């Protein structure tokens, strides 16, 4: 999946290795283009939210296994090299499964809608769905992208999708989508039971964020104000439908069917508004792509049907298929099945431990087996994920 075996120290070339700036709306940071539309920035995220530049534990911080702070993590070239190789490895592990091959393909196709214009006959890119790539002469060129993998902010283990918003549009819920920045680290993982003896395979963790990214890129994320009040056992706790859907499996039990019907109809109409916008367009801003090219890009993204006179429309069956793919097929639970790893069987459990790991060495973790290395003592019984048995690979954090 990933074009090249990048080393962090590889010389910049202004194409797939480059110093870049992120919308807001900072010094340039070294970034690597690991695939069409997908970049990796091996830096702590002090950028997507300028205020969050302090990496020290704040007053009243939580503790492991809820949060973990270390202002020094991912500061050196060696750890940045390891981060890049770690993330690369997880993409290949994900891509090596039919399911992950499909998700990644959906992500690459998921170009954020060009809804930047104020004139409704003009297609224009939204600037916050781009990065600025520095050139040899110190100038910058704007490049559109779908996905960025970036190191975590202050709380090292707070992985999540974030994206830049629009003054008025809800890009992640209006079918338009937006460039997704996934705060993530391959250098840590979490323990669960069944004490936290067993370690989550970091590939499932990344896939979980990629699923969120899929929703957000297709502008179909469920408003976080839609929640389920948790009543599985034991007062107060809520979980968003967006998270329940992302996990899938057992947790589909808690999604209000009547509500899901509302969402499905809502987004169908949103895709319809997109078709209409493409149909009204008479001009396009930019020197690179043609109006007809971009139209085609979004035809493919939303699986629109195109008639004799170039007019677009949404196909009910094709929408149903895509929407189902994005929301029902692409789930953490389904990934567990494809990876054949031990994992939580519900989203609704709290981690019991956090571990430092290193999946870069072939002897530790592989594309095909993760920690459960075939032809080793770690092959059977998820021994590889067993933090006591696979002692060399996990260091529990304080």
């Amino acid at each position: 999946f990933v074009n090249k075996q990048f080393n962090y120290k590889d010389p910049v070339n202004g194409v797939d290795i480059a110093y870049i700036k992120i919308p807001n709306a900072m010094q340039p940071v070294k970034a690597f283009k690991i695939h069409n539309k997908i970049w990796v920035i091996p830096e702590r995220d002090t950028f997507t939210n300028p205020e969050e530049g302090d990496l020290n534990p704040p007053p009243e911080a939580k503790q492991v296994p809820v949060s973990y702070y270390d202002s020094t993590y991912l500061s050196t070239d060696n750890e940045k090299d390891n981060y890049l190789k770690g993330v690369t490895k997880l993409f290949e592990r994900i891509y090596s499964t039919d399911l992950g091959r499909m998700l990644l393909t959906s992500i690459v196709r998921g170009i954020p809608f060009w809804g930047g214009s104020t004139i409704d006959t003009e297609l224009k890119v939204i600037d916050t769905n781009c990065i600025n790539v520095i050139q040899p002469d110190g100038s910058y060129r704007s490049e559109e992208l779908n996905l960025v993998i970036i190191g975590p902010s202050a709380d090292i283990i707070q992985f999540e999708c974030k994206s830049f918003g629009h003054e008025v549009l809800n890009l992640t819920r209006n079918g338009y989508g937006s460039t997704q920045y996934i705060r993530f680290s391959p250098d840590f993982t979490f323990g669960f039971e069944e004490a936290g003896k067993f370690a989550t395979d970091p590939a499932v963790t990344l896939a979980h964020e990629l699923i969120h990214a899929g929703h957000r890129l297709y502008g179909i994320a469920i408003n976080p104000n839609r929640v389920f009040k948790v009543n599985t056992n034991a007062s107060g706790l809520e979980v968003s439908f967006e998270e329940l859907r992302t996990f899938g499996g057992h947790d589909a039990k808690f999604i209000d069917s009547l509500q899901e019907n509302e969402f499905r109809l809502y987004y169908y109409n949103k895709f319809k508004d997109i078709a209409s916008t493409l149909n009204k367009a008479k001009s396009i801003v930019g020197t690179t792509a043609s109006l007809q090219y971009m139209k085609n890009v979004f035809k493919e993204k939303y699986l629109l049907s195109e008639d004799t006179s170039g007019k677009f429309s949404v196909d009910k069956l094709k929408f149903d298929k895509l929407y189902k793919m994005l929301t029902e097929i692409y789930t953490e639970d389904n990934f567990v099945k494809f990876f054949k790893v031990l994992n939580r069987k519900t989203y609704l459990n709290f981690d019991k431990a956090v571990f430092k790991i290193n999946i870069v060495p072939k002897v530790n973790y592989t594309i095909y087996d993760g920690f459960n290395l075939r032809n080793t003592n770690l092959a059977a019984n998820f021994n590889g994920q067993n933090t006591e048995i696979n002692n060399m690979n996990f260091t529990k954090l304080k």
Binding site: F159, T205, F350
Partner: peptide
């Protein structure tokens, strides 16, 4: 995001 993050 994982559930534990809500804490």
């Amino acid at each position: 995001x994982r559930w534990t993050a809500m804490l």
